[PDB]
Amino acid sequence: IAHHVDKGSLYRLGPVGINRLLNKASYNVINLSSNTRSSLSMNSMLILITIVSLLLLVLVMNVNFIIVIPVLISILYILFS
Amino acid sequence: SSSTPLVKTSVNYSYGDYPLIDADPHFKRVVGYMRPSDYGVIGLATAALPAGICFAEWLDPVKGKFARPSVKFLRVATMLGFAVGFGAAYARSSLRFFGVTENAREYKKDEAQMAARKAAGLEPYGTSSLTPELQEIAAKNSAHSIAGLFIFPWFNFVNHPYHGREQK
Amino acid sequence: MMYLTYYFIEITIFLAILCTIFIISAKNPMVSILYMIALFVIAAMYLYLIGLGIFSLLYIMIYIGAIAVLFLFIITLLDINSTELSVKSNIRDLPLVLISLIVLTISGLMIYSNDSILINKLLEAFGNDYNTIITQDWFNIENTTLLTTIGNVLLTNNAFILLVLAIVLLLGIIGPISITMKHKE
Amino acid sequence: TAAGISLTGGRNRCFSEWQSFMHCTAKTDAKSRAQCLPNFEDYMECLHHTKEKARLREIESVLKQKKE
Amino acid sequence: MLILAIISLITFVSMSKLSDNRAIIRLINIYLILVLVLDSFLYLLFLNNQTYTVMGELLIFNSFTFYIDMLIYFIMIVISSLYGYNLYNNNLYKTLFEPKKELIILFLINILGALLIVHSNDFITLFVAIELQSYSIYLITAIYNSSYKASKASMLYFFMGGILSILIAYSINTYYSVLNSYTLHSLDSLIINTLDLNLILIALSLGLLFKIGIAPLHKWLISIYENTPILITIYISLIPKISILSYLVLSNISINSLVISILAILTLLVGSVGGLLQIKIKRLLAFSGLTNAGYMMLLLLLNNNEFSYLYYITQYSISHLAIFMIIIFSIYYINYINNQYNPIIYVNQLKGLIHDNAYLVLSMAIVVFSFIGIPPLLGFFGKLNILMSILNNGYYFISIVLIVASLISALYYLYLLNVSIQDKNNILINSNETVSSVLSYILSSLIILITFGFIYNSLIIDIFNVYFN
Amino acid sequence: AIIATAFAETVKFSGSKQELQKRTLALYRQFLRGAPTFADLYEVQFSIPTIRTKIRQEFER
Amino acid sequence: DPIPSGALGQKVPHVDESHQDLLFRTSHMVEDLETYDEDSPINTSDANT
Amino acid sequence: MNTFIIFIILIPIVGFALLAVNILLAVYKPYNEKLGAFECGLTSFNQTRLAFNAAFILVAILFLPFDLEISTLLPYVMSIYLVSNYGFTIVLLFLLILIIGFVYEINTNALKINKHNKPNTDSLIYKL
Amino acid sequence: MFIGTIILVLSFLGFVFNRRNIILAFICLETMLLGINLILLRNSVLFDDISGSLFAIVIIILAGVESAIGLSLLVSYYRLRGVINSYGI
Numbered sequence A: 001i002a003h004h005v006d007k008g009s010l011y012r013l014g015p016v017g018i019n020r021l022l023n024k025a026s027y028n029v030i031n032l033s034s035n036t037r038s039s040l041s042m043n044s045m046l047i048l049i050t051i052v053s054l055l056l057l058v059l060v061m062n063v064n065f066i067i068v069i070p071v072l073i074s075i076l077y078i079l080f081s
Numbered sequence B: 001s002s003s004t005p006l007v008k009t010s011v012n013y014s015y016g017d018y019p020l021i022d023a024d025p026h027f028k029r030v031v032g033y034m035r036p037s038d039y040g041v042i043g044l045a046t047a048a049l050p051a052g053i054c055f056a057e058w059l060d061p062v063k064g065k066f067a068r069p070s071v072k073f074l075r076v077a078t079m080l081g082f083a084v085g086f087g088a089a090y091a092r093s094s095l096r097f098f099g100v101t102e103n104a105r106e107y108k109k110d111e112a113q114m115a116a117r118k119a120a121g122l123e124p125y126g127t128s129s130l131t132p133e134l135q136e137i138a139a140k141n142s143a144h145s146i147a148g149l150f151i152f153p154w155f156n157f158v159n160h161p162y163h164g165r166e167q168k
Numbered sequence C: 001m002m003y004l005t006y007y008f009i010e011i012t013i014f015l016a017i018l019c020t021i022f023i024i025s026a027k028n029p030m031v032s033i034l035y036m037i038a039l040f041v042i043a044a045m046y047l048y049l050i051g052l053g054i055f056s057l058l059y060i061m062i063y064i065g066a067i068a069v070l071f072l073f074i075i076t077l078l079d080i081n082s083t084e085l086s087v088k089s090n091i092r093d094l095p096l097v098l099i100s101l102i103v104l105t106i107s108g109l110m111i112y113s114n115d116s117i118l119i120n121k122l123l124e125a126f127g128n129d130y131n132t133i134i135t136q137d138w139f140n141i142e143n144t145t146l147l148t149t150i151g152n153v154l155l156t157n158n159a160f161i162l163l164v165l166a167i168v169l170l171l172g173i174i175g176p177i178s179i180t181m182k183h184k185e
Numbered sequence D: 001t002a003a004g005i006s007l008t009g010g011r012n013r014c015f016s017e018w019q020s021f022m023h024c025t026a027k028t029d030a031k032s033r034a035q036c037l038p039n040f041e042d043y044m045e046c047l048h049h050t051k052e053k054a055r056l057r058e059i060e061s062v063l064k065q066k067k068e
Numbered sequence E: 001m002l003i004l005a006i007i008s009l010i011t012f013v014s015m016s017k018l019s020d021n022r023a024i025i026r027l028i029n030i031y032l033i034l035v036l037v038l039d040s041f042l043y044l045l046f047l048n049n050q051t052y053t054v055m056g057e058l059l060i061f062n063s064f065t066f067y068i069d070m071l072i073y074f075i076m077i078v079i080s081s082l083y084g085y086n087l088y089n090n091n092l093y094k095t096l097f098e099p100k101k102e103l104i105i106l107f108l109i110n111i112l113g114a115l116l117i118v119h120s121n122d123f124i125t126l127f128v129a130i131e132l133q134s135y136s137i138y139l140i141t142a143i144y145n146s147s148y149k150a151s152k153a154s155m156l157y158f159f160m161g162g163i164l165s166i167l168i169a170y171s172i173n174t175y176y177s178v179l180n181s182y183t184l185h186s187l188d189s190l191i192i193n194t195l196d197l198n199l200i201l202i203a204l205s206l207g208l209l210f211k212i213g214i215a216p217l218h219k220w221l222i223s224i225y226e227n228t229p230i231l232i233t234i235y236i237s238l239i240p241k242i243s244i245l246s247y248l249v250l251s252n253i254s255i256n257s258l259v260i261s262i263l264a265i266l267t268l269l270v271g272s273v274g275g276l277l278q279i280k281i282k283r284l285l286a287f288s289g290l291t292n293a294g295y296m297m298l299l300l301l302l303n304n305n306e307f308s309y310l311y312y313i314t315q316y317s318i319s320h321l322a323i324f325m326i327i328i329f330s331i332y333y334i335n336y337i338n339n340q341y342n343p344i345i346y347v348n349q350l351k352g353l354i355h356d357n358a359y360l361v362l363s364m365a366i367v368v369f370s371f372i373g374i375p376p377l378l379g380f381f382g383k384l385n386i387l388m389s390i391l392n393n394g395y396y397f398i399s400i401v402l403i404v405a406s407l408i409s410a411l412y413y414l415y416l417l418n419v420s421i422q423d424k425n426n427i428l429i430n431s432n433e434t435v436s437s438v439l440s441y442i443l444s445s446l447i448i449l450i451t452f453g454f455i456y457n458s459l460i461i462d463i464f465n466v467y468f469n
Numbered sequence F: 001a002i003i004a005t006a007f008a009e010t011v012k013f014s015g016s017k018q019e020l021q022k023r024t025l026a027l028y029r030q031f032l033r034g035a036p037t038f039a040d041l042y043e044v045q046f047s048i049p050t051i052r053t054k055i056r057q058e059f060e061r
Numbered sequence G: 001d002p003i004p005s006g007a008l009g010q011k012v013p014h015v016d017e018s019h020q021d022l023l024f025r026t027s028h029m030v031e032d033l034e035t036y037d038e039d040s041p042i043n044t045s046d047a048n049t
Numbered sequence H: 001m002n003t004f005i006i007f008i009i010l011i012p013i014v015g016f017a018l019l020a021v022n023i024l025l026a027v028y029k030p031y032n033e034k035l036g037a038f039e040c041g042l043t044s045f046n047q048t049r050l051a052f053n054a055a056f057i058l059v060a061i062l063f064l065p066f067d068l069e070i071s072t073l074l075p076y077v078m079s080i081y082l083v084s085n086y087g088f089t090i091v092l093l094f095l096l097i098l099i100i101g102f103v104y105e106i107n108t109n110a111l112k113i114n115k116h117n118k119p120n121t122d123s124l125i126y127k128l
Numbered sequence I: 001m002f003i004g005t006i007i008l009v010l011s012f013l014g015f016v017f018n019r020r021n022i023i024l025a026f027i028c029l030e031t032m033l034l035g036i037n038l039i040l041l042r043n044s045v046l047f048d049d050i051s052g053s054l055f056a057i058v059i060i061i062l063a064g065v066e067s068a069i070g071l072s073l074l075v076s077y078y079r080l081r082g083v084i085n086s087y088g089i
Ligand SMILES: CCCCCCCCCCCCCCCCCC(=O)OC[C@H](COP(=O)(O)OCCN)OC(=O)CCCCCCCCCCCCCCCCC
Pocket: A012, A013, A014, A017, A018, A019, A020, A021, A022, A024, A025, A069, A072, A073, A076, A077, A078, A080, A081, E269, E273, E404
């Protein structure tokens, strides 16, 4: 109990696992705009990708909602994994 | 030349608890209906801004030691303070015209002025150099413009008939 | 003889596509500026075609006469290195370029119609088949043109935006002096 | 502010439909605003000519396939 | 008064030396104070929420906009005080913080654009004002032209704002193509439910929102806030946000949008997570502003959102000014000046501030726990009113995301406090130089407002119920 | 005053062979470093090695 | 006892005059964790002279 | 086919007449030094640009706003009668606000060229 | 409607996928404004409306001021750096 539950799984669903989860998610969030060589082309591509992705997502949700849910889950995976 | 309106306006609208005089008063009227309190506000701002910069120099001085600001800055200060005060005075008188503050004196004065104008066969609110269409555009540009005193100044100079009162 | 001048809007559309491609493609950016000038000429043509030659001349005297002049002025005075259009550098863009071309064009043509079903929103945009009847009235007694009316509304109905454009032009003077000049003391 | 003004300084092509619709809006409240549906349909029809285009599509199709 | 100020200061600065710009800033600060004192009685025009249309129908004046204008004047007063009053009369602080000649004029023109954004009723006024804001704030980012980072940020900001302005103009002209109008008053129940109009409207909303860092378009503005001077960052991170969000709150454009909900959730998650590994102060505060912008995006889906927005924007402005002022005050005790422009960059340079100035750390703690939303402070009541509105309007998943973001952001808010209350060797024992009186009073007043403003919440609600209902 | 040109050297007669040694070696270094410039400025139809060979010949003379 | 730690317990660099050197240019860390200034008085002493 | 259209097309698609006459009639047998460019002159691979004074670019940057001002006055002079005594005041305010910026430009001396090698004006003082 | 959308979209793509110049970025912004103005003026003609032409002339003025300010900012960047390279803005 004291070591596998109270200092194991209940710290993993707790201060340790959240810490590791947020370390990885933060690192993935900040290592997204990857190249400091040119800051302009990269963010320009981000405008383009945002507009295109939004348009196609709104198409998909007009077609049917529940299909857009895993698309958003995968987008969060790409952004935060 | 005809001085008759092209569009319908509210009759005796209530901007506050007190009665209405003019919904778009002329500059001349707003300045002639000023009270001594308004001139006091003007002088107050005119004196407060230069005294303000000297007070600031007293609290935290620019250099290490206290030195009264130049007469350059005091002059520009007096001018800007007079401008701020004229703004506040114009706003106070215009709000008395709108019925937002107490306007009994101004009400009786407007009544007497309009009665004298009718006696002299003059048009109420004056005769304009502009066509009726431009009077309308001017009223629509100047009506309730004192709300934007913080941003821009705008004043009525056009002598239009679109003050929100009964026809006579 | 009648329909020799029918496709002069389509020709301008074609030439505009060409000049944009040449802007993107030109080796020296001076040539890109010259092709931008040619695109302004094409737009001015099209504006004459649809009945707005006043705007064509305004464009010629403002865009080509000042803005393009300033572009040439700066590239004559500043070192602006350039990488040439390459297949080892730019071919990676083709998938996203094509996807975005299709999506953006189709959405830009869909956005103008109010129909509920999505496919019909493009099909109405391509529904340019039927001609407009131009009947004549006799009610306009004056010689009011587009510039006269622009002045009328801008100086009476819209005086505020003119007196705000004044401060925009003040910025256009005061900013560049603050950024380019170094004040002694 | 410059609404309802033409290129020549006067009323625009679709002024009357807009003015009818705005009369009906002035008559109405947000709960009775659905009475102004035909007026707004007329204004939009004057603007974009969708229904007339569909009508002419029908006319042309009868001129098109029922003959050849 | 602003245009009078601009037309006066242009002449008076042209006919004055560079030795006089600080005193000029002091003069115009007192001018703005006198205006906010003497002309603020105009609130009586808006009794029972009376609304006025001015300059034809190009501007709108109500209690909302009057309040935002008073707030922007208050902000400009504080930001001008930071430029017009020396912290210390040393050569260092006469090298770090000097006003440039044209800076005050550009600030006032940007304030003009801000207010003409919030007061706009027609899209031509909105576009002219958006451009008057954005050009001026390009030049504000660029006025310190002896900085490589600032010039670079100037140009990035120019191009990205240009593209987003293209988007706004496309939205406006498409709205005109559909309805033949530039006015949102032209919309009603019938027009909304008869025309599908959400693409145009959300395109406008996003063109306005990506100009304040709404994800996934946040990195560029965070780089701009990092790379600019501290006393420029404090302005360019706040006033555009107030202006644009106030326009989008007054204009009921995105009442139940799915896209705005999605992007607001994304802003919350990004602004909470991405700030956890930031070692620099300005990037941390930028991600804080991002998550607060998300909290304020949430109330663009409500249709009754005035109280929540005004409370939250006022408290966020006070907290933002206070935290930047504390970072500005901490430069006297940091042991390593990084730049002439950003003298303090990293959070670990605040290590041991409690042993040099303890009450500065008390201020920092108050502001940090207001950001976290700890009662009885002001951010708690902000978050409470936002939650009240969004749960009254049926956003139940967004609420849980809001709680989780409130929790994740506390870590990087507490990073500052934690390192500040740590122990340090080589403490301060004596110093004959004293910090300014005016700026000290301003900071203390902001902290006291954060701490004791909850006393007046009843009174504020009673005034709101007369002027906004 | 009348200021000197780009690569001028004030005339200073060494009172020692050991100092003039260093001066001569520096001048040799400068000629060798400048030979590419001599080939670019003067439209030379031969090698930069040839220019350096000639410099060495004239210094051996 | 001191080694600088971050908000999430992670390693942070102690930023000195140490690594405003020409060595630590031309490295490709993200904008957040770079530590090369480009406006430092160490690097910008000869600038437009 | 109007005479305006005929002229404005004819000038470009005929302007190369003397060009072709000159290309066909005239000699062309270049030398290296006839393809050259000057009496003396040279430049190594030093740079592609020369340092320029600020006024050289500021005159061009300020041409844009003043040109836009003077072109924005065109609607007024084509509307002058219809906007009678209202637009007059408005355009006067416009011109005054835009004269304030011109005043700024003059007082800053932004189009002036400054001289580095000043003449020495300081006295000759001998420590005794 | 067509010419303007085409110019706009191609200018946006030539802005986004520019690995060459900064001048191309300036050009693509100006051509984007051009495309918007052309759609705007075509609608102005079809509706017989002045608000479109007013917005168009306002865009002309604002784009001129934008160009002036942008090319002052570039000149500051060049004051400090001396060369405007393929990358790095
Ligand atoms: C419409 C439906 C939408 C509903 C939402 C659906 C959710 C979709 C989520 C997918 C989006 C991607 C986010 C995935 C997390 C990012 C990091 C990751 O990949 O997880 C791994 C991380 C690893 O830790 P470790 O094994 O030590 O390191 C080696 C990893 N290669 O993991 C760990 O650190 C250990 C994890 C232990 C478990 C901790 C559980 C804590 C639960 C509270 C979470 C609160 C924080 C939320 C953070 C939000 C992040 C987006």
